[PDB]
């Protein structure tokens, strides 16, 4: 399954907008369920 993002410092926005964490995945959300 896909690693969840729990506390999205976001912090209601997409999770490309996430301060520290940078992983890239997440950002690319408009794409299949993406891995934190």
Known sequence: GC???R???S???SPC???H???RAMCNDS???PPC
């Open 3 to 5: 690693p969840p993002c």
């Open 7 to 9: 506390f999205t410092l």
């Open 11 to 13: 912090p209601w926005v």
């Open 17 to 19: 907008s996430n301060p």
């Open 21 to 23: 964490w940078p992983i």
């Open 31 to 33: 794409v299949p369920c």
